[PDB]
Amino acid sequence: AGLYTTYQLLEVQRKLKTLPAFFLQWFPRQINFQEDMIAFDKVIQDVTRV
Amino acid sequence: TSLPNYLAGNGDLGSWEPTQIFAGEADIVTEGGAAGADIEIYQVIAKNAAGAMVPHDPTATEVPAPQSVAIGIAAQPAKSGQNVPYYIGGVFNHAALGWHASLDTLAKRQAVFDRTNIHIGNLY
C-alpha cells in the first residue's frame, strides 16, 4: 500500500471460442488442382428396361 | 479473350446425346451424286428431273414430279452444286432422319421405302 496496491495474480481465464466442424463431414474428399476449373460428367443409365 | 477469370463461378459445359442412324442389318450401300438444293445430314433425298439430288418432297407435281419418290439418305450435308454422299441401302432408324412435313408417323415414313433396298424402322 501507499505507493501502490500489492496484488496476487490468480490464473488467467482464457475463453477460446471456436466453430467446430460439422458440415465438412459430408465433404471428405479433397482435391488440390491447379487447372482453371473443375468439371463433372454425370451419366444416367436406364438399365431397367425389359 | 485476354484475361483469365479470378472470380468463382459455375458453368454448364455442355451435353452429348448419341444419334443412332442404323436400326437393323441390311447391306449398307452408298453412292454419290450432285446436289440440287441445300441438303442436311441424314436428310431423305430424291432425284429431280435433271438427275440432281434434292431433299425428298412428296406431293410435288398434275402428274407426280420425280422429287416425290425418295431415293436415299444423305450421309453428309451439302450445298447446291456440291456432291452428296448418300445411302441407297441399309435399315435406318426413322427418328434420326430428316423428313418432309406431313410425313409424320412411322406408318407413312415406311411407305416411302417399300419398293427399295433401303428399309426404315423403329428403334426399340
Side-chain angles (χ1 to χ4, degrees), chain A, chain B residues 1-60 63-124:
Chain A
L3 294 174
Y4 58 87
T5 55
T6 51
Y7 290 106
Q8 237 186 337
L9 276 206
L10 305 183
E11 317 58 20
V12 74
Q13 298 190 310
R14 334 191 80 91
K15 185 194 185 188
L16 191 286
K17 207 179 196 182
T18 60
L19 190 173
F22 178 67
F23 287 90
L24 292 172
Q25 81 193 333
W26 303 295
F27 301 74
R29 274 141 50 61
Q30 177 173 351
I31 207 74
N32 304 331
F33 73 107
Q34 298 185 36
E35 301 76 329
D36 215 51
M37 295 182 72
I38 277 175
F40 298 114
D41 287 333
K42 60 165 183 163
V43 194
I44 298 181
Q45 298 185 323
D46 177 331
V47 182
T48 59
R49 199 163 185 203
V50 169
Chain B
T1 57
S2 54
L3 285 164
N5 281 7
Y6 294 109
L7 266 44
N10 65 294
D12 177 288
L13 175 155
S15 66
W16 173 78
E17 81 205 349
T19 278
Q20 313 214 10
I21 193 42
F22 308 121
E25 187 187 354
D27 283 297
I28 289 152
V29 169
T30 81
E31 261 185 50
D38 186 11
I39 298 194
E40 291 96 301
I41 219 162
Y42 310 117
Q43 188 162 29
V44 175
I45 319 164
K47 284 212 291 273
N48 72 3
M53 301 305 268
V54 172
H56 170 233
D57 169 346
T59 76
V63 86
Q67 306 92 279
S68 68
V69 86
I71 309 185
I73 291 158
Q76 313 294 340
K79 304 332 171 303
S80 166
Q82 306 178 341
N83 302 75
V84 169
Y86 59 96
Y87 301 103
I88 188 74
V91 152
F92 292 95
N93 168 20
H94 84 96
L97 281 53
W99 293 102
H100 194 67
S102 80
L103 182 42
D104 36 37
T105 180
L106 174 59
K108 294 162 141 303
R109 292 173 178 188
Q110 293 214 320
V112 180
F113 289 86
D114 281 337
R115 201 50 41 187
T116 80
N117 197 5
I118 292 123
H119 159 269
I120 306 172
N122 251 356
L123 296 177
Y124 183 57

